[PDB]
Amino acid sequence: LHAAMADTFLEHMCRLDIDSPPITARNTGIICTIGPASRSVETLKEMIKSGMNVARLNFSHGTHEYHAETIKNVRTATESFASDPILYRPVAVALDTKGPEIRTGLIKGSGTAEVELKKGATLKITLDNAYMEKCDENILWLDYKNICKVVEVGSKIYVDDGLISLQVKQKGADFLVTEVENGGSLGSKKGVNLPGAAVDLPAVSEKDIQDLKFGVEQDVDMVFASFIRKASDVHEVRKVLGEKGKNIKIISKIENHEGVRRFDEILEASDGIMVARGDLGIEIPAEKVFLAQKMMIGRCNRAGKPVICATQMLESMIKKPRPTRAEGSDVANAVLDGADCIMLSGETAKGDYPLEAVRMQHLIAREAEAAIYHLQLFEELRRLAPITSDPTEATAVGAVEASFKCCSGAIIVLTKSGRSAHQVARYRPRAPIIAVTRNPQTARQAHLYRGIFPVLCKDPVQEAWAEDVDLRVNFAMNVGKARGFFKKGDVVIVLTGWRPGSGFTNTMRVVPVP
Amino acid sequence: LHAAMADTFLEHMCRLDIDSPPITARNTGIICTIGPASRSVETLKEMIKSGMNVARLNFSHGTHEYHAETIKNVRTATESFASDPILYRPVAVALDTKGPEIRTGLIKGSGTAEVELKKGATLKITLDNAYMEKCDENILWLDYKNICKVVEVGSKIYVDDGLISLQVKQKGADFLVTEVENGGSLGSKKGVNLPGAAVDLPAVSEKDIQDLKFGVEQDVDMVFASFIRKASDVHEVRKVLGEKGKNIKIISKIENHEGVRRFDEILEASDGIMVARGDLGIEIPAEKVFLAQKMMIGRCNRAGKPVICATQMLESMIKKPRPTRAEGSDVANAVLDGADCIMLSGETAKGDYPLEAVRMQHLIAREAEAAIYHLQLFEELRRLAPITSDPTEATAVGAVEASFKCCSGAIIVLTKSGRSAHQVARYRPRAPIIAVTRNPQTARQAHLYRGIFPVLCKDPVQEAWAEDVDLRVNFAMNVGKARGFFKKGDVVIVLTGWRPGSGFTNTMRVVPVP
Amino acid sequence: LHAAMADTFLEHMCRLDIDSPPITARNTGIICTIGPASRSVETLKEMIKSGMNVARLNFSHGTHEYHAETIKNVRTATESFASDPILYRPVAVALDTKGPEIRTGLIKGSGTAEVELKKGATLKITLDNAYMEKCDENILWLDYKNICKVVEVGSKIYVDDGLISLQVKQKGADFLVTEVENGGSLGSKKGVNLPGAAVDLPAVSEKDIQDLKFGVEQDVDMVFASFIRKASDVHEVRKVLGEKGKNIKIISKIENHEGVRRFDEILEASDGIMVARGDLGIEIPAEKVFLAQKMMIGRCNRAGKPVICATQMLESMIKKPRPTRAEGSDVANAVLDGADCIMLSGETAKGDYPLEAVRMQHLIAREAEAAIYHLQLFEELRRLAPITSDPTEATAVGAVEASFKCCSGAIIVLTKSGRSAHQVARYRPRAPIIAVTRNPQTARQAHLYRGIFPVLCKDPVQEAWAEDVDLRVNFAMNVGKARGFFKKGDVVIVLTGWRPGSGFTNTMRVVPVP
Numbered sequence A, B, C: 001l002h003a004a005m006a007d008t009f010l011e012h013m014c015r016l017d018i019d020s021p022p023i024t025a026r027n028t029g030i031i032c033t034i035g036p037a038s039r040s041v042e043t044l045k046e047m048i049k050s051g052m053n054v055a056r057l058n059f060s061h062g063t064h065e066y067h068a069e070t071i072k073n074v075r076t077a078t079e080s081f082a083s084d085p086i087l088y089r090p091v092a093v094a095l096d097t098k099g100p101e102i103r104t105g106l107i108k109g110s111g112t113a114e115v116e117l118k119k120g121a122t123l124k125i126t127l128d129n130a131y132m133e134k135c136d137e138n139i140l141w142l143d144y145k146n147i148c149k150v151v152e153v154g155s156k157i158y159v160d161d162g163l164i165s166l167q168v169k170q171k172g173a174d175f176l177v178t179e180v181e182n183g184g185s186l187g188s189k190k191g192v193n194l195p196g197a198a199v200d201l202p203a204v205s206e207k208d209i210q211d212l213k214f215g216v217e218q219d220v221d222m223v224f225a226s227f228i229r230k231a232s233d234v235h236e237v238r239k240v241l242g243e244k245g246k247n248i249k250i251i252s253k254i255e256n257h258e259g260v261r262r263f264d265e266i267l268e269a270s271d272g273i274m275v276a277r278g279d280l281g282i283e284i285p286a287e288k289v290f291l292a293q294k295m296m297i298g299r300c301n302r303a304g305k306p307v308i309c310a311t312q313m314l315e316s317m318i319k320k321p322r323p324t325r326a327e328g329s330d331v332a333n334a335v336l337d338g339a340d341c342i343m344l345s346g347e348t349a350k351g352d353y354p355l356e357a358v359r360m361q362h363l364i365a366r367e368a369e370a371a372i373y374h375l376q377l378f379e380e381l382r383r384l385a386p387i388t389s390d391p392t393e394a395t396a397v398g399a400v401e402a403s404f405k406c407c408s409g410a411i412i413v414l415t416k417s418g419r420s421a422h423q424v425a426r427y428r429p430r431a432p433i434i435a436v437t438r439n440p441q442t443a444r445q446a447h448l449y450r451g452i453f454p455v456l457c458k459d460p461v462q463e464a465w466a467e468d469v470d471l472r473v474n475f476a477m478n479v480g481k482a483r484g485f486f487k488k489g490d491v492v493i494v495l496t497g498w499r500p501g502s503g504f505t506n507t508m509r510v511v512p513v514p
């Protein structure tokens, strides 16, 4: 069939043809953020068609009533296509908690006033509530009260997303006094970031307790936890969600210097990571951000967890209907490291071209998945995996290995919680992974793991349990075919259990497509 | 000293620390394009300080007199710093030939008029010189006369850089008739690209014969040959430059579909390749461009030739003083594949922030060079190298291998033509490669090869030839030290010859820095 | 030149041609043991011609006067060929200390009497000196007095080299009582081995103090230390040899179960290891011996120390003038793991065919060295080597790497202590390593390290030190040529120092053979 791949990564690279068409499948999910440009039910319907799999609601701005109208919409459109059970794509919702902040007071007493900070001028920073609504050039008010026990001398404060830096000269309780390093106009209520620091602010703010608690009532499918410093913050979110929402998946945003520095414990606490390049690139030097992303996707692949990758991905596509080259080869380049799914923010929320920005992330990811150098990635992922006695693990590795050798067009897996699928995707198989579930929710959170293309079975449960398995498999063939992942007389791997239940997948059969 | 690097590329990735400071050296050159924003001698002086190594003059717009004033400037600034012979960086000039084009005539007879093309409307394209200066919606004039023997039915024509596509329906000599696929306003004298085609236009245009011939008179250091389809075009440029400019280095721009498809022969004809992402991304689908870049840098590493990499690299830094994340991790990502040096266009020619855009390409490249996974790249580059009897080759590989093992802070190489250096850089040593030449020109074209940091010796030739070698080495120590590539009591590898001449490098010594 | 070697070890194997003639060089030394069949000066002369490099004197049997006549001979023959300074091979001597033993007394009072031990019969073992010279079937006397504090219940005793095993049933001080497991006739004064045990006998016996002390007076080149259990035994030998013989190289024989179990510390104490398959295969089960050999040569390659490999190598060549296949592919198979030199015992001491047994170990080793899979062995030996700042190390790795690439016919190294050579051989270069020394002793102990082919320079020291180096190199060319390791216009790597002394090798030149 397909000829033997290159013996080395340099040989591999050199052989990349651009006349070679890719598979119809696309292995990395696409998360859109929903805003003004894309809250309408016509737009959302049209987006779902283009390849959107996670609608992400941004709980920074807008009221609880405003978001509910958005979810109501996302669902109306998701559920339009559910007449034809074969062609129905399911669609996750996700809630992006606002997080902790430090904030500036009202400058000169006004609502929107400007102050010029020079490149050497001295600033006292007072935590007394008298100077807010009378903030000047000389005296600034910080929202954060506990700053002086955190910030040491030399530690810089970045203001208004790093437009203004300033270096701390002397701290004497109630006030720290600083020399300003970067200049420009300052406003009122503008966010403060203090690099290299261990900030003490509460893990969930007062606002974000109502938000998470709102999202369990609204039945969201995952929560994107903002500003995560310790494993204990991730454990706080898990507490608030409570046993009523104990399924909801927590994805921590790594956002600050401390977050990176303690990455390894946060991972062992979350259900997946988001690399939030936006904020990360203020709290540490922009020229380094690239390394933190690589590192993180790295460790997340080894651990087997999903890593979303976010922010500024196709930024120029707010204004112009085509991206720049940089934007093209940044998307392709996350997808190559093994980002699990990728994020559009401004481009889908606010831009003139929401449909295009999706259609573009579709095409790009798709070609890039065909450039991955499997038969040296796979071989490394094996060496780095523990020898255990667990049937499900053994079957899932075997199923991947087979898939290579027979060039198989898919891997049907019957799931229930999703875990059976999740193991297969831990190996990055070249074939797509149709997973076939009854649990409507399992279907939605599958969109995180790279590879898995979930399908929801509505067909009511047969009497004889063996015949209920044979019904579900045959669904997954009729779905693969009407999509184009294989034809008749092709070859598919099918994972299955031996009894009914969860956690008894042990059988891997290799069947020709009927 | 430095601990043993990871056993695998996934292990490697996972270990990338962001608290680990990089080497003071920077291995990939920076090419600025000189325009209005950066023709002044104050700006250029300040740029050279930031890390510019190739000034690229763009022979599209402007007259011969206008460019000469630019070169005169580049040189005045280059030569400012040549009082202090240790701290003098040399600076290449490079000439970007305009190339062949196809062009539209004057619409409606006017200088600047607009015509709306709909999404299905029919167009005749006439090559009769009557319809130019009277071009309408229905009839368009093409500069190219020989189009009908090239373009077949189905082949699309992209107009105004792909704003307007149109598909060819019937060709009947003198005129081809088309259905328009993409809509929008069209102008007068706007460039035509015809994908998937083998275009017959002359290799050097009439204009570009005067340009190349101008650049030999002005003593440029390399020529960036635009629109290169065959090895015979590259051979045409080499003819025109003549024996008077037989040193000048030809870098072919790969720009069209055919260029890629025949890459392998063009390489064996040029002195190095430029991947010109700008144009490449119209002539083929934007989602594929990434693969053509990888492929090309790939093959160029194996062949040992330099590959420049160009266009849209830090595009947003025309308007705002910081890049987007995409722009950051696109620069880092060329540098990781093994782009040899990188290009700023708009950002340096036209933008508000030319110095910043350089300072940013400096910092980025520098961190990214410290993330390269050497002790599996090096090992592959060996396996893929021919066993030959040539002393110079054997010494250069040995010198690299040593450099690994002793963690050596540099590799001094005494050159003359440059070839001795060029072999060492063919291995991508982690250490910088100080090359020490008398030939002022060799010094300028060193900036192409990745790693090489050339220094020009002015100290007059000693009597005893052994003592002339010892003078040159000691220069390269005093230069490495005042830069920071090593201290006293560090360890450097020094390549040298046995007789004087060219092509007798055979000795590799390993010395402690005095 | 020579085509690129296979990408994998299975591919490698499959490509082994038997029509491909090997290099004239032979990289693994040959140690003969000198006995009756080969003490004559005619035989020894003829042996030296065949390829003997270490004469090993066996200090078990014979008096001090008898051995001295043997050394006197070995030297007379070594020194016959020293008229022609180019063709003179130097020849090490080596002393095999008898070691500790446990021994049986005189059976039935007689000099040579027989006793039948059945397969279940009970034996008391008494340490009272009354029962010796009256040893029976029921009561046996052991030389070892301290046995009962060492041997526990279950520990088997092997007698007469494991002809008779017996298992210990009850130990009650002064006597242990046993059930016999293997049957056959027993004699008087026949050696006892007690498996799995930590034996307390002195490191150097009373006899072996006179022997070592004899060997320093006779100026032997290394000592083969027998029965080595701890690093403290190896440290005892080093004490006895004293500062008068502080150069003499100690090679520990690993011989018992404990020896293997503590291998790692013994290595860090000795100057090289001998795997003594003879004895090892009684003290542990014969089917395991193979693994202990592999393991040991293994660790010794990583540590960079030489491993001799011994015993039963060509055993059938005592009686018949050709070996069995097993004997052929056991020699080839040590040489492939990376045994550093190999031992003939009976075959050279006692056999009818001493010259043939050498000529056979010559031919075999030689073909086998051409089957080693270098360009995956070398690459592993690098990864497993520490990054240090030591010039000599860096030069020696570089020199090996070069040698690969230019297919170089030799590596001349000017030594003095030998250490410069020893580093190069730590990499297993395919080329032979001519080392050129003035120190006549350094020349003799070079025969241990695999690869090194030492040559002794007699030419008196020139005035100008640079010209003294150029004299020594040119010797090493005239020696390589008259041997056949290269011709005119071939290519050789030459390591050298920068000052005179020891430990300043830093220069690696790559020269064409004059």
Ligand SMILES: O=P(O)(O)OC[C@H]1O[C@](O)(COP(=O)(O)O)[C@@H](O)[C@@H]1O
Pocket: A414, A415, A416, A417, A418, A419, A420, A421, A468, A495, A496, A497, A498, A499, A500, A501, A502, A503, A504, A505
């Ligand atoms: O991914 P999970 O949660 O282990 O689900 C696997 C289960 O799915 C099945 O294949 C299908 O059975 P169900 O009818 O219980 O879903 C079981 O045989 C198996 O144990």
Ligand SMILES: O=P(O)(O)OC[C@H]1O[C@](O)(COP(=O)(O)O)[C@@H](O)[C@@H]1O
Pocket: B414, B415, B416, B417, B418, B419, B420, B421, B468, B495, B496, B497, B498, B499, B500, B501, B502, B503, B504, B505
């Ligand atoms: O890179 P090239 O052109 O081979 O130059 C290498 C030459 O440089 C030298 O080291 C310096 O000698 P020169 O004085 O002739 O430059 C020669 O010994 C050697 O052959």
Ligand SMILES: O=P(O)(O)OC[C@H]1O[C@](O)(COP(=O)(O)O)[C@@H](O)[C@@H]1O
Pocket: C414, C415, C416, C417, C418, C419, C420, C421, C468, C495, C496, C497, C498, C499, C500, C501, C502, C503, C504, C505
């Ligand atoms: O193997 P060793 O003991 O380091 O000997 C290396 C020495 O040999 C030499 O090359 C030869 O010099 P000598 O005349 O002192 O032997 C020195 O330059 C060098 O340091």
Ligand SMILES: NS(=O)(=O)c1cccc2c(O)cccc12
Pocket: A336, A337, A338, A371, A372, A373, A374, A376, A377, A380, B009, B010, B011
């Ligand atoms: N981009 S890639 O396909 O080269 C790649 C991505 C992730 C991990 C890899 C690995 O562990 C080994 C080789 C390539 C990898």
Ligand SMILES: NS(=O)(=O)c1cccc2c(O)cccc12
Pocket: A009, A010, A011, B336, B337, B338, B371, B372, B373, B374, B376, B377, B380
């Ligand atoms: N970016 S990188 O360091 O992983 C790399 C770049 C070019 C070639 C490589 C290769 O041949 C093998 C591993 C990594 C490479």
Ligand SMILES: NS(=O)(=O)c1cccc2c(O)cccc12
Pocket: C336, C337, C338, C371, C372, C373, C374, C376, C377, C380
């Ligand atoms: N016999 S061999 O050439 O295959 C060999 C011997 C010793 C070590 C080796 C190694 O580390 C890797 C491959 C082959 C080896």
